[model samples]
Structure formats: structure tokens, C-alpha cells
Target: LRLPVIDLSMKNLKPGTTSWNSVRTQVREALEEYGCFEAVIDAVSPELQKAVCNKGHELLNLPLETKMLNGNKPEYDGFTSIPNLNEGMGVGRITDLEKVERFTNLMWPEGNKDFCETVYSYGKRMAEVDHILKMMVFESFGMEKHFDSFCESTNYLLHFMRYQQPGKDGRSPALSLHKDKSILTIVNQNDVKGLEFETKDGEWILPTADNHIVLLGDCFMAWSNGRLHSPLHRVTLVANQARLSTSSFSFPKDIIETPAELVDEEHPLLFNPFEITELLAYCFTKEGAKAVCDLKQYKAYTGALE
Candidate 1:
């Protein structure tokens, strides 16, 4: 699956511009077909991106005890242990510098100011980029009216993950195949490769780090009444090199309902209204993906259900 790279720095990103429509069409096609795309912010240099990404790598190198202090939880906003060589730390609402501070301070009480500053800075930039991509997603659906509300209220989760190099006897996979529970996810990876996602045609493909990978998740798919797709992606372990990625996820702060405008006799309402909290809990349980799929009630998609 060939994913298009969208240049976010274009002046035509706004509505009513020739470039806006061109970008929107590309976005709509990706969401409906591949469920993911690579995005490059116009003025952001690769050095700028590597700065924060390297910080994620540095943070993950901390002692296991230090990382465990923020132990992963079932709610999707804490430290979590993967079955294999991957470990993750998450903080909710990157827009809150205080929260970012609390998270960094907990792991580094000695005050690693650089880590805090860099990660928060990275998150702030990601938020801005996410807001635009979100609006464009709605515009692509001809439902731009929801943009303002969505921007003001969507939940954001910032994550830092590390996938260690496969040892002679270590696990082969860094993580399992799964769809994110958020409305959208922006993943920033290091130069090392490991991330891969299943495309619309069922082929597994690796995404390059030259651009940020933007994925429409199960929440967005159901919120759009099956108008979007949530891709199933995973990380594959490299022979001798580790991988690190920083991701910002956008979650709905309100109950998901199919837009009234999108529902008709031919295209009926496809999902039941649901909250993200309950959905996250279910995602970690024995039910896992299968249970989440039931949330849509009419599709084989994976999402949230309690």
C-alpha cells in the first residue's frame, strides 16, 4: 500500500483554496482506503524532529525500576509492559505543561529539564499539526461544522515508546497487531525501522520516518459512522538496533454519535454511542480486539466496547 505524503506547510491548507481541496481529497482517500498517511510539516527540519525523538530514546534508557514507577495501566495513560521487547510511557493531555512536568519529574526527580522541555515542545507542535489534520478530515467528509467543537474538546494522549533490538534469544516482535483507540494518532519515529501497518488491501507495509505517520483509529471510524478506517499496525524487531517513537493520540471527549447529516436510509447509523474510557479498559482485557469490534455493531472493525 503506497501511502501519500502530505505537506502540511502549504499555505493552501485552509478551506476554499485549490490546495485545500487537493489535500482534502488525498486525506479522504487515505482514510477510506489505507487508513493512514505520512505527513511532513513544511518548515520543520529533520533535525528539529530528531531532537525530540532522540529524547524519547534517552528517556527509555532509564533503569527498569525508574520506568516501572510509572507502570503501564489498562486505561491507556500510564506505563505499560508489552509481552516482548517493547515498553511504553504515556501522559494524558500534552497541552498541559503541568502534566508533562509531573510525568517527567516522576521519572527523573533530579530534574532533567532538557527531557521535559523537549518532549513537551514536541507534543505542542504535534498538537498544532493534529488540529489541522483533524479539520481537514472533517472537511473531507463535508462536515466541517464539527471541527471547532472537536478541536476544543478532544482528549490527547502523549506516548513515548522504545523497542529494543532483538537478542539471539529475545522475542522477534516488539508489539502485537492492534488498532489505536483514539480518533487520530500521529507517530514520530527515529531513523530506525520497526513500524508497520496492514493496508486496506491486507498487505503489511513499513512506514518510513521521513514523515510522521497519521492513522485514523477505531474511534474516528465509528464516530464517522464507518466513514473512516482504523489500521492494524505493529512493530517488528530489528536484528541489532533499537527503535523509538513518540506518538500523540486524539481521543473523543464526548460520546460518539454518527453525524446526523451522514445518516440516511441508504447509509444508516452504524455505531452505538460510547465513551472512550470504557473502551480502553476493554482493549486490555481478555476480550481485547474482538470485544472492541462489537462496538460498531455492524462491522468487523476493532474499537472500544465495555
Candidate 2:
């Protein structure tokens, strides 16, 4: 299976259940190998899941002029239109109630009370779920001491996206083959499935979309001292049905270098510290997917001297 579902519901998300340990082991192994995994979230309702997507749907239906009125340019945090194929709106780095209000007001002025309620509450719960996974993965690496500090300093992003289905022609990929810049990303499947994950051997496989897909990004690889890898992935536009997905991207407040615990003489840092802003700058440039490789920091003088 390209994306295996690692059951988390049985553990009740408690830290020390027999099931929790098993879940952690499964997650640890998955991270070590694929850098991604599907997780079952029993707490999320289909209705709640649909509401988040519906918000994206609701925005997409508005008149172009109306959407442009409050358009996605200023501060780059509100509604955005991607030329040719994408429509999205996002809220990020929200660490307070006031920030929540600002986000909701920007999206809905006359105001979607239900939509705000659903998205905010869902974001909160999802953050908790993401943190739980973070701690579990940290513990698995014997890096529990750093988990709490890391959690306190991370920023979060809530993104809502809708991809239009292509015509009878061959489906174009909805997203390019790129790795996420955040440390970790948790996505709500939204009932449609055209997502594919790349294997180490350069083959792609369709992942099951019935549950959440948790993925490690470049930042985590740096933090783990290159012990874990981030997989390359993309989504394909399907024929006849549009696809929608809601995701929370957890990023560090600042760029991360390899942790001291994971670094030693044998395994030096493999990446130079790079901030989120720097990464985005390269990501949007024409150089595109090759941007990530530019950030690598390996040995310059240790080839074969001695």
C-alpha cells in the first residue's frame, strides 16, 4: 500500500496505552521510511469535515469582483486566486482569539457564524492531534526533552483549497511535485482521492483518502538531523468531480538547524538553517521544485583527505 492507515483511534490518544505504543511504533517506522502516513481520526465528523470544504466552496461561488474587493494580496493571508487552476483562502499563525476574529471577519463580513465556529473548533482539535503526534514521534527518537519547547514555538496554518476538475483531456496534476515547507502537515481527506505519494524508487502510488494523511516536511528533516526523510507528493485533478481539502501546516517560529542531540561527529548537520519566508521565495520562483535542493548543507572539505 502506498499510504497505509495507521489506526490511532484505538489508543484514545493517551500517552501510555498498549495501543498507543503500537501506534507510535507504526508511526515511527512510517516516518523513517515514507515520511507520510494515513491516520484514523474518530473525533472528526463528516459534517464538520464537509463544512470546512464548504467554506472554500462558498468563497469560490462569489462574484469575481466581490472576491477581488477583499482579495488575497494584502499581507497575503486572506482569499487568494491562483491563475488557471486554484482558489484558496488561508489563516495562519493564529495564537489568539483576536487573530481568530480577524480571520473570520476577513472571510465573512456579514458573517458565516457556522463556518467560523466549525473551522476554528476544528483547527483547535487538529492542532491538538498534531501535537500529540509530534510528542509521540519525539519520544520514539528519545528526544522527548525537546518536544514541549518545540510545540511552544511553532506557528500553524489553516488552509482551505478547491481544485477544479479538468475536461475530458488528460488530468493535469493539481499540485506540483514538491515537499511541504512546514515541519508537519495534517490534512482532512474531504471525501475525494487523487493524491499520490512518491516512493524512494521513483514510482508513484495513489493513497487512500478515507482518513487523514500526516506528512513530515523539510523542517522536520533538519530537526531530526536528516535521520527521517520528507517524501515528494502531488495531487491530480480528476475527471467529473472537483477535489477539496483542508489542512493545517505546523511550522516552526524560526528555521531549524539539526538539534544537538541528533548531531555528532559521525552525522553532522546535513542542511543549513532556512526560514519559512526564504523557502517560499524560492518555491514561487521559476526554478520551482529544485529550490529545496539549494538549501542543503553538507560537507565541503571532508571528501577524502587524511
Candidate 3:
């Protein structure tokens, strides 16, 4: 079955309008039901998608030594690889054109104008869609007052990923099933099918490429006091062609905790207040790596259940 699709192309779909409210309802419902939805964002054009994917491939094609030069400050910001399965890098603060330029210059000392501009433009568009999605989510929960502060206290990262084709055995090495650590994620792909999201009932479904897939992450699940779902997803490349995808991940600059409004009699607190830094630290540990596959395990590992 297809994931719910939301058309976010209306020019006048601002808050307080009937159109905005209708879409907002769908957003909340879809998140609560499937933990993700397909968003038709007109800001991301076909040309832009092609350019971004081209730049992504160019970046990935750099020599291993060159790619290794990408310093990992907060971990995984630099080049990362999973053997023959996947390899990619994440550009932090991608919304800042200056920073994007700096990153581009770091990779290409001679300067690549097209790469810088295309990446920056794509990041800006994705960031806009991210803002709109968060705003709708906050408004849906009657937490619109908290929207401004949330926006101010957030940072963005754009991760360019490439999944290799199947091995000689003709069998694909699948990326592990897990929930994302970000509050929200917007994923765009380049024609290859691989990503799959597991339903609440344990069935897997493939999302179409006609729209960007907007997913609620673990942090959002906790922040919403478990009102929304943070789905378990994975990728397996069955096609002969390698899969390319870019995911825009949004993280909170401040600690995330369930607002009191989301914690009432029927909806008791489900997660403890936690910092993303600490959560990442734990997730990187040997024990955390094996245990923290999903939110329940994360809560248990951190003693949130105590």
C-alpha cells in the first residue's frame, strides 16, 4: 500500500487558513498512523534533484584519501562507510551558504562553483520544507507557541548516501533496521528503490519516489510523549544500479523533553528528558550499539524506565 501523500504546493497555505488546517490534520494523522508520509514539495524541482544527485555522486567519487580528509567532529559528519553496503558523508549547517562553500572548498581546493550553489540551493529548499513540517506538527498538537523556540533551537544536516549494487552472489547487503535519532528527516532519492519502512504490524512497504518521504524520528517520538510513531526502517539494494539518496536531518540544539501538555492521565510520560549528545554517545558504545535498536531499548539502556 502507498504511504499517505500531502500536497505542500499551495501558495497561500499559511497558518489559520482552512487549507493549512486540513493539511495539518493529515500530517498529524499520518505521523500517528505510519510514522511517515510522502510530501509533494514543489520547491524541489526535477532539475534541482538531478543537480544535487550529480554533485553527491561527484563528492562520493573523490579518492578515499580525499574523502578521509573530512574531519569527524561530532561523529559521522565526515566520510562514513559500511563496507560494500553504503558510503556517504554529512554536511552540517547546510543551510548556511558560507559553510557550504567552505565544505566545498575543503573538498575541492580549486573551487567548484556549480557544486556549491547546487548543494546550497537544495539544502535551503529542504530546510524550508522541514520548517513547514515542524510548524504543522506543533500547530497540530496545539503547541504552536513553542514553535518559534523549537525552530531557533534546531540545527540541520544534509547527508548524502550511496548504496552499492548487489555483490557477486547477487544478494544485497541490507542496512540494519533502526529508527533515526533526529527529530525529523526529509529523504530524497535518485530513482533507485531500496528504502523500506516497517508497519506497526511488522509488514514492510516501499515508498514511491514521486515525493520526498518525511519521517518522524526517535527524538520526536519522545518529545511528543509517544503520541507519534518513529518507524523502523532499512535499505536493501536489489537493483543492479547503485542507489543514491540525500537525507536532511534536523536536531535540537537544546535538551528534548515531553511538554507537560502532552502528559495527562490517558497519556502518561513515556520517555525521560535526554540530551541528543548523551543519546548519541550511548548509541556509539558497544553495549548501546547492540541494545539501542529502538526507543524501548534506548529507554531501558538509559534507565528511563526506572
lDDT of 2 by residue, 172-209 (tens): 77776767777888887588776788877788877767
What TM-score, over all chains together, does every model reach?
0.87, 0.87, 0.93
The C-alpha RMSD of each candidate to the native structure, in angstroms, is 3.6, 3.5, 2.2
Q: Which is superior by TM-score, 1 or 2?
A: 1
Q: Write model 1 residue lDDT over 1-306, tens digit each, in one string.
A: 568787777555666888877887888888888888888775446766778777766766788788777655736766666655777777666777898789788888888888778777777777777777778788877778877876667677778888766764433677778778788898877676678888767798887667788898777887677667888888875557777887889887866666787767666776767777777876667756565433453333333332
lDDT of each: 0.74, 0.71, 0.82
Pick the winner on TM-score between candidates 2 and 3: 3
Stretches > 4 Å off in candidate 3:
73-76, 167-171, 290-292, 299-306
Off by over 4 Å in 2: 63-84, 286-289, 292-306
In candidate 3 the C-alpha lDDT for residue 7 amounts to 91
Error of 2 at 251 (Å): 0.8
| Model 1 regions lying over 4 Å from their true place | 10-12, 71-75, 168-171, 292-306
Ranking by TM-score: 3, 1, 2
Error of 2 at 140 (Å): 1.2
Clashes of 1: 3
